[PDB]
Design a protein around this nucleic acid. Structure first.
Ligand SMILES: Nc1ncnc2c1ncn2[C@H]1C[C@H](O)[C@@H](COP(=O)(O)OP(=O)(O)OP(=O)(O)O)O1
Ligand SMILES: [Ca+2]
Ligand SMILES: [Ca+2]
Length: 431
DNA sequence: GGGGGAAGGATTC
DNA sequence: CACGGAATCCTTCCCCC
């Protein structure tokens, strides 16, 4: 059934949307032509110099390899899909998918065999699965089912820190310590009879995958590695409802990534993947022995990242206690080109922004407005201030101008918008 | 020269 | 019958000291 693309492509070609992609895709394909050339003109000598620099560095990274923490990553299974299939049985053995007709968020495994995967227009999906059932999301439910899963994690790490509703990291390195010598009374749980769990990190995670099960009906995969970088990759190795671990010794970390696809990493995306295969980089093992050249093509802050993924290095301290940098609200709709109407919705927006921006009492000193053209061309203007602006009023006050500035710049021709947005940032976060 | 800040990308759930 | 919303981090420039 791999000829899905013959329906996917077949129903995107002309699309206002597709057209825009080409440029996004060309522009990038060129950022590459540039990188390839700028490279080809590097002194076969500079590498000797570079190499030394790099190697030297690594040698040290390697010396401070922190293999003492046992990080765990829990990742729910088709979370939004699952939750709904649970609450409304009539679905159960049918092909569903949370989201709308425009964009789909998750999909149960059965609906996936048709091609329905996250981030795929709703209408498109129904072409691969006419018998589909699209359920509109109710974040108020999920947000809540999550907190029941969290309360369970807590009994394992007070500062668990959660990346999202379906993901979360844990440092069971401490709970592990105080468990080795524990009776069997604190390690048995009732079914619905009992089952008792061991002391290995393998079992501790098995107990968590269990406590959750029997308190939601939902299942989730998990990974266990010395650092958070591998944990995220490891949880998916044996999904759904499963897990995988990488022991603490060096070799494990190495033998693991040895032939691991660079993209798989929780940071390498569509661009970095293409952009890197350009130099022939596919696995971390390859990447590692191109450390010289890399060091002279990607800004410093970057090859640092790559060098890490080469050695199998990740973080080992789940910061915790959300700092928060920005905060926003946006929305797409039907072409709104009418002059007046613009400020109009903008009013409503800023309102919501401040509105939501109140529960937590914060105040930033720079507003950002986002205007998305009818042909998916974005543009974002923002202006800084002296204040700490907070009330719905204060905000619009600025946003209206920035918005105006554009209507003029492109004045006697209307601004055919498809989406608009207002993001507030620059919080003092206490000085 | 260096230290933000604005613009627009890349990434993930 | 027409490709989300929200956060955060990164890549380049241009501007004021
Ligand atoms: N663009 C998106 N918007 C909202 N949610 C998304 C988006 N992309 C993915 N997700 C969510 C929906 C699912 O919970 C999940 C699917 O992506 P995936 O990379 O497989 O994560 P996952 O491993 O946690 O989910 P799964 O158990 O389905 O495999 O992430
Ligand atoms: Ca999930
Ligand atoms: Ca995952």
């Amino acid at each position: 059934k791999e000829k899905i693309n013959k329906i996917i492509m077949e129903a995107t070609k002309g699309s206002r949307f597709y057209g825009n992609e080409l440029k996004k895709e060309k522009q990038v394909n060129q950022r590459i032509e540039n990188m390839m050339q700028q490279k080809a003109q590097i002194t076969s000598q500079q590498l000797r110099k570079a190499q030394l620099q790099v190697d030297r560095f690594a040698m040290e990274l390697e010396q401070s390899r922190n293999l003492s923490n046992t990080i765990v990553h829990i990742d729910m299974d088709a979370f939004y899909a699952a939750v709904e299939m649970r609450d409304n049985p009539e679905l159960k053995d049918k092909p569903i998918a949370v989201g709308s007709m425009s964009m789909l968020s998750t999909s149960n495994y059965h609906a996936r065999r048709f091609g329905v995967r996250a981030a795929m227009p709703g209408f498109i999906a129904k072409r691969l699965c006419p018998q589909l059932i699209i359920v509109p999301p109710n974040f108020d439910k999920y947000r809540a089912v999550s907190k029941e899963v969290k309360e369970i994690l807590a009994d394992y790490d007070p500062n668990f820190m959660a990346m999202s509703l379906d993901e979360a990291y844990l440092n069971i390195t401490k709970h592990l310590e105080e468990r080795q010598n524990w009776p069997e009374d604190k390690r048995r749980y009732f079914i619905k009879n009992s089952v008792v769990f061991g002391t290995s990190a393998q079992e501790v995670v098995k107990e968590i995958r269990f406590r959750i099960e029997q308190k939601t009906t939902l299942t989730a995969s998990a990974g266990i590695a010395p650092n958070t970088m591998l944990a995220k990759v490891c949880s998916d190795k044996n999904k759904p409802n499963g897990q995988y671990q990488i022991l603490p010794n060096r070799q494990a970390v190495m033998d693991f990534i040895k032939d691991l696809p660079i993209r798989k990493v929780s940071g390498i995306g569509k661009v970095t993947e293409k952009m890197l295969k350009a130099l022939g980089i596919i696995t971390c093992t390859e990447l590692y022995q191109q450390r010289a050249l890399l060091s002279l093509l990607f800004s410093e802050t970057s090859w640092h990242y790559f060098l890490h993924i080469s050695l199998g290095l990740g973080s080992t301290h789940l910061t915790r206690d959300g700092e928060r940098k920005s905060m926003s609200v946006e929305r797409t709709f039907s072409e709104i080109n009418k002059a007046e109407e613009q400020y109009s919705l903008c009013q409503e927006l800023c309102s919501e922004l401040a509105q939501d921006l109140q529960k937590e009492r914060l105040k930033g000193r720079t507003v950002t407005i986002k205007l998305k053209n009818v042909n998916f061309e974005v543009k974002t203007r923002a202006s800084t201030v002296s204040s700490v602006v907070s009330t719905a009023e204060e905000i619009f006050a600025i946003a209206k101008e920035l918005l105006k500035t554009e209507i003029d710049a492109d004045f006697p021709h209307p601004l055919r918008l498809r989406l608009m947005g207002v993001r507030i940032s620059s919080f003092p976060n206490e000085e």
